[PDB]
């Protein structure tokens, strides 16, 4: 019934988001992996007037991995599309950049892919 | 966060206007020199508000959805990178641009690249 | 029983490969998608002495999309790992670069992910 | 293919020695300035042997597995990019470096980046 809701990726991370009428994404992310505990703030944007031809809805969001419990000195962005239907899905690719010195900046950024559904593990 | 807050440009001639809040928020507007884009677009992101002090960059990311009250490309970009302070401040990024597609075309939905931003003097 | 064999990705593309003893990958690729028909030459490398701790086997390969039938003026590289087991798998991330002018070089490279098994569709 | 064939360097100080064959093959050796690497490693790749003549680059890619008779990092890099000819010839790339990992650690297996190669004069 839309982007707003509670989503889970293939690792069991929990993505709770609200899609504002004019394109805002606002919520929290709890990661099952990495140097992370509890919830982290997220913010992003989505296409609030998608095509009407069967295409998905483009979107993206960011988390910086600092909260009251931990600071990993890193940030992830997810870029992807929402696909509506009986089992709604958000398919993404992500970039996780850690703060580095300039000379190790070559090993600063991990890449991967996450797919989200509203099915709770 | 004084360092990040300001006006920036990338190697394509795009410009990025941003304000870094005490809570880790990035807000502002983006004007792209390339692609299916005109005028300013809203951006929103996050940064590490308590970075290391050991000669590391400050991790940050932001998103633009390419819809404004003038044009809609049905697409969104995220930039992931780090701010490097000092007199010649830079934001070094890699980005992902996803277009809305049909399922059969999803394999060709996402472009990747890298942008370098240089800060300019208010 | 190893990297050598016939593999299929989630799109139904066919990847036929031989893993040489000292690290070569040599074979053909037939793509179910894009500006492609029939087989294309591939070449790559893999770790011919992987860790013995349960880790996967790192690898990569390239196809340039020119054969006797078509030339798309593009090339893909896949980077990933082989995971042995009862349903062996190769998990990859890929980059597809098209030849462009310098000023459109910003839109030259697509990214995605392919997972391969030996199960024929 | 005279253009591609030769010695190249990237912005990290790594060097790439390559021979472009008539059949579309790339062969050679790579010496990395960074990471868990020493001495030369085999590379192998492909390029478009009949590129456009319309002022486009020539698409190419190659792979190195980081095992040689001296060291083994249990990892591999692929570079995907284009050759831009002329007097100041360049190869502009983006790359993926995958390390062998356990299944539980596969989420952190792959680094991404970009390398610029400049040709040097035999
Ligand atoms: O370890 C660190 O630097 C901090 C935590 C990184 C967490 C990531 S990993 C990719 C993305 N998807 C997911 O479920 N979590 C995030
Ligand atoms: O055409 C579309 O879908 C909409 C416009 C995309 C713009 C992008 S391209 C990479 C990034 N860097 C920059 O200066 N602009 C953004
Ligand atoms: O259209 C073009 O430029 C030429 C053909 C590109 C084919 C690709 S798309 C990603 C990769 N995986 C797969 O099954 N095929 C390849
Ligand atoms: O540490 C390891 O796993 C083995 C060594 C990795 C080397 C890489 S890093 C990006 C690419 N560019 C370059 O000059 N070298 C390669």
Question: Please, are residues C55 and C40 in contact by the beta-carbon 8 Å criterion?
Answer: no
Which structure tokens are listed for D61? 């890619």
C114 alpha carbon, closest ligand: 3
The answer to whether the CB atoms of A99 and B48 lie below 8 A apart is: yes
**CA within 13 Å, CB half, C119:** 10
Rounded Cα–Cα distance for residues A118 and A121 (Å) = 9
What spacing in Å lies between the alpha carbon of B38 and ligand 2's midpoint?
A: 10
C109's torsion region: left (phi>0), alpha (psi -120 to 50) or beta? beta
Question: Please, are residues A56 and A81 in contact by the beta-carbon 8 Å criterion?
Answer: yes
Does A61 count as an annotated binding residue?
Answer: no
Rounded Cα–Cα distance for residues B115 and C17 (Å) = 36
Rounded Cα–Cα distance for residues C27 and D1 (Å) = 22
C15, C6, C11: which is closest to C113 by C-alpha?
C11
Nearest CA to ligand 1 atom 13: A31
A79, A25, A9, A67: which is closest to B93 by C-alpha?
A79
What spacing in Å lies between the alpha carbon of C71 and ligand 3's midpoint?
A: 12
| Distance from the B64 Cα atom to the nearest Cα atom in chain A, whole angstroms | 6
Which structure tokens are listed for A98? 């850690």
Q: Considering only the beta carbons, identify the residue of D94, D99, D109 that sits closest to C109.
A: D94
DSSP state of C92: E
Rounded Cα–Cα distance for residues A34 and B31 (Å) = 34
Query: 3-class DSSP state for residue A5?
Result: strand
State the virtual CA torsion across D73, A31, C93, C49 in degrees, nearest 10.
Answer: 20
What spacing in Å lies between the alpha carbon of A33 and ligand 1's midpoint?
A: 6
B3, C36, C18: which is closest to C28 by C-alpha?
C18
Structure resolution in Å?
0.9
The answer to whether the CB atoms of C107 and B12 lie below 8 A apart is: no
Question: How many CB atoms lie under 10 A from the CB of residue D36?
Answer: 12
Give yes or no for C112 touching A (CB within 8 A).
yes
Report how this structure was experimentally obtained.
X-ray
Give yes or no for D68 touching C (CB within 8 A).
no
Residues in chain D: 122
Q: Taken in order D43, D46, D51, D55, is the CA torsion positive or negative? A: negative
Rounded Cα–Cα distance for residues A30 and C39 (Å) = 44
User: What's the 3-state SS for A30-77?
Assistant: ECCCCCCCCCEEEEEEECCCCCCCCCCEEEEEEEEEECCCCEEEEEEE
| Distance from the B95 Cα atom to the nearest Cα atom in chain D, whole angstroms | 11
A106 alpha carbon, closest ligand: 4
Block residue for tokens 């919520």: A27
Question: Please, are residues A53 and B102 in contact by the beta-carbon 8 Å criterion?
Answer: yes
Residue B49: beta bridge partners?
none
Residue B96: beta bridge partners?
B78, B112
Q: Which domains does chain A have, with CATH numbers?
A: 2-119 (2.40.128.30)
Exposure of B108 by Cβ count < 10 A (0-12 exposed, 13-18 middle, 19+ buried)? middle
Question: Please, are residues B80 and D113 in contact by the beta-carbon 8 Å criterion?
Answer: no
Going through chain C in order, the beta strands assigned E by DSSP cover: 5-8, 14-19, 24-30, 40-46, 57-66, 71-83, 89-98, 109-116
CA dist list (Å): A83 to A13, A58, B118: 19, 9, 37
In short, whether C31's Cβ falls inside 6 Å of ligand 3 is: yes
Which structure tokens are listed for A42? 């997220």
DSSP state of C50: -
| Distance from the B31 Cα atom to the nearest Cα atom in chain D, whole angstroms | 24
What spacing in Å lies between the alpha carbon of B111 and ligand 2's midpoint?
A: 10
Question: Please, are residues C112 and C97 in contact by the beta-carbon 8 Å criterion?
Answer: no
The answer to whether the CB atoms of C107 and B35 lie below 8 A apart is: yes
- Chain D residues whose CB is inside 8 A of the B94 CB are 112-114
Rounded Cα–Cα distance for residues B112 and C110 (Å) = 6
CA dist list (Å): B121 to A87, B4, B6, B8: 50, 12, 8, 9
CA dist list (Å): D112 to A5, B32, D6: 31, 24, 25
- Residues in B 9-48 with any Cβ partner in C closer than 8 A: 12, 34-35
DSSP state of C105: G
* Full DSSP string of chain B: -TTT-EEEEETTS-EEEEEE-TTSEEEEEEE-SSSS--S-EEEEEEE-SS--SSSPPEEEEEEEEEE-SS-EEEEEEEEEEEEE-STT-EEEEEEEEEEP--GGGGGG-EEEEEEEEEEE--
> CB within 8 A of A64, min separation 6: which ones?
A40, A41, A74, A75, B24, B46, B47, B48, B49, B59, B60, B61
Give alpha helix (H) positions in chain D: none
Nearest CA to ligand 3 atom 16: C31
Exposure of B16 by Cβ count < 10 A (0-12 exposed, 13-18 middle, 19+ buried)? buried
Residue B63: beta bridge partners?
B44, B78
Rounded Cα–Cα distance for residues B1 and B49 (Å) = 8
Query: 3-class DSSP state for residue A107?
Result: helix
Q: Which of B16, B28, B37, B79 to mutate to test the pocket of ligand 2 (most atoms within 8 A of CB)?
A: B37
State the virtual CA torsion across B24, B99, C109, B61 in degrees, nearest 10.
Answer: 0
A78 alpha carbon, closest ligand: 1
Residue C58: beta bridge partners?
C81
> CB within 8 A of B104, min separation 6: which ones?
none
Give alpha helix (H) positions in D7-97: none
């Amino acid at each position: 019934a839309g982007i707003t809701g509670t989503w889970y990726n293939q690792l069991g991370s929990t993505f709770i988001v609200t899609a504002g009428a004019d394109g805002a994404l606002t919520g929290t992310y709890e990661s099952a992996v990495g140097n992370a505990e509890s919830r982290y703030v997220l913010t992003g944007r989505y296409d609030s007037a998608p095509a009407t031809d069967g295409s998905g809805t483009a979107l993206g969001w960011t988390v910086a991995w600092k909260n009251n419990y931990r600071n990993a000195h890193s940030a992830t962005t997810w870029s992807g599309q929402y696909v509506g239907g009986a089992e709604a899905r958000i398919n993404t690719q992500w970039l996780l950049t850690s703060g580095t010195t300039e000379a190790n900046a070559w090993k600063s950024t991990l890449v991967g892919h996450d797919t989200f559904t509203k099915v709770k593990p």
